[PDB]
Amino acid sequence: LTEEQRMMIRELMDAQMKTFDTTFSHFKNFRLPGVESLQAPSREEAAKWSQVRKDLCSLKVSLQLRGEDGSVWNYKPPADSGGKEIFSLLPHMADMSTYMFKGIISFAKVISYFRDLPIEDQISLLKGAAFELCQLRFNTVFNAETGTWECGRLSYCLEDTAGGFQQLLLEPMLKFHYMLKKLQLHEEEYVLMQAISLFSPDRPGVLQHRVVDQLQEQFAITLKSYIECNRPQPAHRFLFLKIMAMLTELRSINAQHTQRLLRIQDIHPFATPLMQELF
Amino acid sequence: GLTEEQRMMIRELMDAQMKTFDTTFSHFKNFRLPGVLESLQAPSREEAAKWSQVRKDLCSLKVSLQLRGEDGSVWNYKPPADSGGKEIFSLLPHMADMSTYMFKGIISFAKVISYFRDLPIEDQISLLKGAAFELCQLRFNTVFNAETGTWECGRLSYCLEDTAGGFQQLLLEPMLKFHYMLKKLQLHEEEYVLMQAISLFSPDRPGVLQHRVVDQLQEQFAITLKSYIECNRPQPAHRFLFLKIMAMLTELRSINAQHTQRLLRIQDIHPFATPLMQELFGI
Amino acid sequence: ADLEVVAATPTSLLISWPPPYYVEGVTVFRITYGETGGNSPVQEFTVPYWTETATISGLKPGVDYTITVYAEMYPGSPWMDIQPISINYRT
Amino acid sequence: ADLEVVAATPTSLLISWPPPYYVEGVTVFRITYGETGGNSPVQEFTVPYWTETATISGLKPGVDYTITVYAEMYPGSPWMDIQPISINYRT
Ligand SMILES: CC(C)[C@@H](NC(=O)CC1CC1)C(=O)N1CC[C@](O)(c2ccc(Cl)cc2)C(C)(C)C1
Numbered sequence A: 001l002t003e004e005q006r007m008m009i010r011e012l013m014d015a016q017m018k019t020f021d022t023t024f025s026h027f028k029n030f031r032l033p034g035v036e037s038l039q040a041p042s043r044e045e046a047a048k049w050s051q052v053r054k055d056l057c058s059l060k061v062s063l064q065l066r067g068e069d070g071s072v073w074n075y076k077p078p079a080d081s082g083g084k085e086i087f088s089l090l091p092h093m094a095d096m097s098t099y100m101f102k103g104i105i106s107f108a109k110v111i112s113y114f115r116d117l118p119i120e121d122q123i124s125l126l127k128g129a130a131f132e133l134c135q136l137r138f139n140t141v142f143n144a145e146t147g148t149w150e151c152g153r154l155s156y157c158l159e160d161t162a163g164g165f166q167q168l169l170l171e172p173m174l175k176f177h178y179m180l181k182k183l184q185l186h187e188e189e190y191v192l193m194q195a196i197s198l199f200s201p202d203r204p205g206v207l208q209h210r211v212v213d214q215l216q217e218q219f220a221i222t223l224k225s226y227i228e229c230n231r232p233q234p235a236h237r238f239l240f241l242k243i244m245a246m247l248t249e250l251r252s253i254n255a256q257h258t259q260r261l262l263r264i265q266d267i268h269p270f271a272t273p274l275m276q277e278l279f
Numbered sequence B: 001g002l003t004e005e006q007r008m009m010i011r012e013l014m015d016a017q018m019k020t021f022d023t024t025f026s027h028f029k030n031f032r033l034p035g036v037l038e039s040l041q042a043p044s045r046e047e048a049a050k051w052s053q054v055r056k057d058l059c060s061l062k063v064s065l066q067l068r069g070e071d072g073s074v075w076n077y078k079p080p081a082d083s084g085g086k087e088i089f090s091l092l093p094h095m096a097d098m099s100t101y102m103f104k105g106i107i108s109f110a111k112v113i114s115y116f117r118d119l120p121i122e123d124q125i126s127l128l129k130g131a132a133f134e135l136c137q138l139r140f141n142t143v144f145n146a147e148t149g150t151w152e153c154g155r156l157s158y159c160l161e162d163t164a165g166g167f168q169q170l171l172l173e174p175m176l177k178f179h180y181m182l183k184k185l186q187l188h189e190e191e192y193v194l195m196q197a198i199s200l201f202s203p204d205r206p207g208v209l210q211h212r213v214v215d216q217l218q219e220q221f222a223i224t225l226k227s228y229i230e231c232n233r234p235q236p237a238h239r240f241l242f243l244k245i246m247a248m249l250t251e252l253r254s255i256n257a258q259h260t261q262r263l264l265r266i267q268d269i270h271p272f273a274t275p276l277m278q279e280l281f282g283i
Numbered sequence C, D: 001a002d003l004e005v006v007a008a009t010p011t012s013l014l015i016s017w018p019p020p021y022y023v024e025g026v027t028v029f030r031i032t033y034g035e036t037g038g039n040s041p042v043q044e045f046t047v048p049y050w051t052e053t054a055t056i057s058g059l060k061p062g063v064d065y066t067i068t069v070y071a072e073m074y075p076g077s078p079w080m081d082i083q084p085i086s087i088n089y090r091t
């Protein structure tokens, strides 16, 4: 592996370590359910409610909060009923995305090839890759056997459908975590994957297209090379292309997500000022 | 048949229950919860355990809290494993608020009954100070589910933790053997309330000045109870029921003693009792 | 003889109320206290009908607090009369 | 150098701050508000380093409030200097 590639990984790895708290020990003062939008009878053009329900039900999770003392507080969300009930966990998730976003921005800011870029293009990359970077980080704490995101004191475990697994993987977001987990990537791979997602020229708002596309290509080669050096090449020949395809799906999940969020925000403003500034 | 003055007593007692016992617990609100914003750990004296004794009384009565929300959500607390001590008291500030809600309703119960207001203040104070815990435990048994080991209190649910242990260890604790044995009896609403009256009007209680005036009332309700069983239950199989119920109240009086003692040891470590618990309890 | 403050330190208070004419039947006395200006969330506790004295603790020094006593009747007759008795104290 | 109130109703506010000096340094801006006298529990929210304007809503009419902006650095160099900028308004 070449010395400039080695130098990039070293940097990217340091940014992860400096900006990703795998323990979530500093995620505090978050809202909890039973601790927001008024139900509809009226309506005719909602309709809009049925679509939001159809996007949200597939991503139903239960919250488990372990206490220092040893106690375990556990929330089981309501079944769909009519409305409102479906959003009980979204104000907590807003605070969860906000914690995650601070760390993502911090990640980018640490990397040299990010500060060097112009402000107008810095703004464009973080506005477009924040969701993706955060989803990659979430996958690192994901347990595919139990369907849980282990976030230190917090734990978010997907609800049964049966339905699923047939219904479960029909939702792109979950097929992603499950398929990405299967790959069993190194810390080096997840962070390179994070770099390639960050420095994406295709993103709306990017003025200096050439300057960014050359960086994406660099990390992409750095990734492809790493696999050719640190993994037994016969079986792990097709891994680079698999990872690259996952990032294409991650870009399309991001699209699907921005769309789902606008429909959610149309019913009630759940998004925090930081979430707003990024979306 | 049951005589008109006995009929009149039951009618009164039943009305007091209806007026003062909320089986839904819908007005028990603003209660404290664990992990929601008590005594500092002992590192590590000679004359404590006491700590080990308190631990030995509390572990046998370990329950988990389940809070159903209107919307349909279910918040569920699993208490810590013992560690020592501090962990052991996580649920006691909630239970203080639970006893306080229960006590209001008990006092209200007594106040409704004619043969209670008629009594002198100094003797009213003595009966409620002595029977509040017992009346409340009888009321708790009404919402007990012996199959699941749960006290179903409307939105709230308190389910006993696994002994492992087993049922051998479970019933070795007088308090639980009581709920389980009292449940088995499958008493009528009339029986639970008569049982409540006999426990309330107990002359033996410390502080009672007008001993005869109270003992005559206990005897009345006792006959009213014994008579009810002889009228509304098939006498061959239900012959021995009155004596069984009477024995349960003797055990309830001794559980009360054991409890007052356990509470003083708990209070010696940290003051958990609310002002109403203190006055009803000797403070 | 209102409500009155029997004795007080800048942290604790002793309150007395005359034990009025309806005990038959009042069941409990809801006693409240909070810093006379609104902002703090109002504190409350109950005591049995037979009590004429109560303690209010943890107060802040040289602060204006408001105290109120609510009589709670057993279901059926008052004495459809109440009022809550009140007093304001500086520690 | 200073934080100002661009426009305000008795319920809402528009705030502006001139953008250091730094960044590289700063990930996000922690913006705080609460009625200046103590009692109310202080409110906060963050905005990205590239923002010069923010909105503060749900305020009470005619009421002395306190606003503060904290700059949060990415791990490694400031600019080891900070200070938080402050202002007071009554709607
Ligand atoms: C992976 C997916 C199941 C899920 N994770 C979780 O349930 C918990 C685990 C990651 C911590 C997730 O990350 N999301 C992404 C965030 C979300 O889109 C949303 C968040 C906040 C607001 Cl205001 C509106 C919409 C969601 C609808 C919550 C789905």
Ligand SMILES: CC(C)[C@@H](NC(=O)CC1CC1)C(=O)N1CC[C@](O)(c2ccc(Cl)cc2)C(C)(C)C1
Residues within 6 Å of the ligand: B058, B061, B063, B092, B093, B095, B096, B099, B140, B151, B153, B158, B175, B176, B259, B263, B266, B272, B273, B274
């Ligand atoms: C029957 C027994 C298991 C139990 N019930 C419960 O756990 C669930 C309630 C709904 C029925 C119970 O009634 N008790 C009685 C009360 C208690 O003694 C206590 C309360 C408050 C304080 Cl400050 C100190 C002590 C206790 C140690 C909590 C044990």
